[PDB]
Design a binder for these strands. Structure first.
Ligand code: MG
Ligand code: MG
Ligand code: ZN
Ligand code: ZN
Ligand code: ZN
Ligand code: ZN
Ligand code: ZN
Ligand code: ZN
Lengths: 105, 105
DNA sequence: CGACGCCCTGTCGCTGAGAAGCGTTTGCGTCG
DNA sequence: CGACGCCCTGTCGCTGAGAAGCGTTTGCGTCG
């Protein structure tokens, strides 16, 4: 698949309690799905757990999506706090992402 | 147009005398054509004058295309020398491009 | 290196991906 | 700032562009 997936900014008002209930706690408990899942930028795993929504208009693609364990262990932030933050920008947007590809550059 | 144009490596044996005869000398003498023309990376002008062919396999798109005046005035190299060089890499490939966008980063 | 044990329960490799060009576009300077 | 003159004959702005995910993928260490 060549082209870049769209990036949609979800307001904090549109975040539902069901989405917060589905924030992954342990990476071994993830459920893989090629259709309904979403891909975390850190671990590069496409799973159905709730992931962070980057709210920077300049942000693009799926770089802003992070899972529970990855955001917690690699950046000390909670996905639930990130989803409820109207001004939350992804670590790639802030230029502090430590994934195997971004730290390489 | 969203997607990236292909990059084709032309061996020095395939360079013809007609192509060398069409290397631009003065940027004011260029002929614009949206169909048959090619775009220089430095001046960002799509014209029909012969342009450099970057021979790095890792190179992609049309970043390696430079016109006569731009390569001469901005990098001190001749397009004819570049086209006849089997190991010629574009200034973006060498990370020394001084166009308005690359020097900005 | 893949079995087990520990506490802070965890993450890299490969492929193919990585714009392009039309429009407000061309060096320097006195000078009206 | 857009006419003119100079020699080394020239280049920036805007838009939309800027992957994604399956596969060889999960912290630390003694130890067989
Ligand atoms: Mg490629
Ligand atoms: Mg865009
Ligand atoms: Zn993750
Ligand atoms: Zn972002
Ligand atoms: Zn990253
Ligand atoms: Zn040019
Ligand atoms: Zn190149
Ligand atoms: Zn450049």
């Amino acid at each position: 698949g060549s082209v870049t997936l769209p990036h949609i900014i979800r307001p904090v008002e549109e975040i539902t309690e069901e989405e917060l209930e589905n924030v992954c706690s342990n990476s071994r408990e993830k459920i893989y799905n090629r259709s309904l899942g979403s891909t975390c930028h850190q671990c590069r795993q496409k799973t159905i757990d709730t992931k962070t929504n980057c709210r920077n208009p300049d942000c693009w693609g799926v770089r802003g999506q992070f899972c529970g364990p990855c955001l917690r262990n690699r950046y000390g932030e909670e996905v639930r706090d990130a989803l409820l933050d109207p001004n939350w920008h992804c670590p790639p947007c802030r230029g502090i992402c430590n994934c195997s590809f971004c730290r390489q550059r």
